[PDB]
Amino acid sequence: VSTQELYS
Amino acid sequence: NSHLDELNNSLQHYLQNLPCKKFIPVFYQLAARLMNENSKFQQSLTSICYNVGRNHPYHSLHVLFSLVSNVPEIENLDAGSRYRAVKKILDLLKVNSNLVTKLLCSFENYVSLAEWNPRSKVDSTSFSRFPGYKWFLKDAANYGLPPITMNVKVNDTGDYSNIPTVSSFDDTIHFASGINAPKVITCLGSNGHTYKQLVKGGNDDLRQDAVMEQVFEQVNGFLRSYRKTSQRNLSMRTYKVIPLALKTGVIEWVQDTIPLGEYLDSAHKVYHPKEWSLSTCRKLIAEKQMEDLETRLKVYDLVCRHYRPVFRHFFLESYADPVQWFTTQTNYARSTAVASVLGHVLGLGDRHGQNILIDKTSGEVIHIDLGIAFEQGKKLPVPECVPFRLTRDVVDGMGITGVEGVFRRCMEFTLETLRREEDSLLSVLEVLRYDPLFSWLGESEAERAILKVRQKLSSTLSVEASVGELIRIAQDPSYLALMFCGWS
Ligand SMILES: Nc1ncnc2c1ncn2[C@@H]1O[C@H](COP(=O)(O)OP(=O)(O)NP(=O)(O)O)[C@@H](O)[C@H]1O
Predict the structure, then answer these.
(1) What residue of A is the nearest CA neighbor of B380?
(2) Who's near B252: CB < 8 A, 6+ residues apart?
(3) Which intervals of the chain are annotated as region G-loop (chain B)?
(4) Which residues form ligand 1's pocket by a CB distance below 6 Å?
(5) Strand pairing partners for B169?
(6) Which of B138, B164, B286, B417 is most enclosed, with most CB atoms within 10 A?
């Protein structure tokens, strides 16, 4: 896994 | 307008005669609208909810539980009032009885299953697992019910006993665990077909995914009621979503598929072993994060020169003799073009290979985990440039022809069909706006988002010019370099 965590 | 009862009178004298079938497409929002306070509008909404929950348990009960599943009391929100109202509607639908409580028990069992997760990895024939799984091996033996993930056809009368109910569930859980918790559970079927249910314990925005899938289904309807947008048989493919809870929902693990991200990592090694691995690319770009524009473009050009495209080989040597291969290739081109145009229109977020599933024997693409929407990414702590997913491997997979031909034609037909039925679309997006369920990552980014939607569909620029500029902006290496690590 490596995609951006899309976190707030 | 939900203030004066006089308006509501002349409409409650009509909607009570409306068939329940008409109220299902918007029942997510409508379900979000009910409340426990007593008003004539509230009375009409309660009647609508009872009508759909009694006549068609299947298409409404999962939403009903989704809005009643987890709702705290101390914190004050319209979610709590809608929970009280939806619980009252559930009790009303259960008084009249066996099927309602059967579906409630099925949802509770599915959410409890999704709650827990062990650590393992399995594939191929045969497997056994699961603690406390007696309920899943005798479902129809106890409660004759369908597994929650078939597209049950809507019937005008409403009550049918011909729906297939499945009791035998395979003991295998080929669970593969990504971020957070994923469990896969495959059950048999009354007709004799197995359905795979992907339950997620991680806080994936499954409710946003569900409303997005509703928008996708209505878009399939729009493409259906037209000449050009249906001779192609184009359709933004939808995978059924049944979110019992936002954090612990369950979706339909689509029939046999290999996700794009999990694919072409083995194909990259097998087809091009000499070229660099993803490790060299990844954190090399990692070194690129703090560099300037020219350095970023230079290192990206180097790594993209190293790693030649490889996804073009999936459609070869896998499906069949050429006619099936070409039908699959055009299916992939059309589905990915429609999905990309729609995601650009609605500002869909993450578009990595881990969120893309290629069918196989058909080729239609299925975008998964569309939690970020309405232009949510780009504006990430780490910024992006591309509007929709278009790498070099993806355009390699569209065929020898790049994105100029069937892809661009499908995209432009999609654009013109979406513009022609704009008014209905922005109506749908408006009813999304006024409910507090869709994520738009008082005044909200949703308003500017739909304004940008209208601008993207604005007729000021010719549709052909718009598709050309979209293809250029999503194919140019200068934009692609800044996107993120990988994305070759
Ligand atoms: N409809 C589907 N078809 C195929 N695979 C699916 C489907 N739904 C979910 N999956 C799988 O479930 C996982 C989805 O990713 P997920 O578990 O949400 O981790 P994630 O972190 O959110 N994605 P990412 O951050 O890009 O790695 C992948 O392993 C997919 O293969």
Answers:
(1) A6
(2) B149, B195, B196, B197, B198, B239, B240, B241, B242
(3) 175-181
(4) A 1, 3; B 176, 178-179, 182, 198, 204, 239, 251, 253-254, 257, 259, 262, 352, 354-355, 357, 366, 368-369
(5) B187
(6) B417
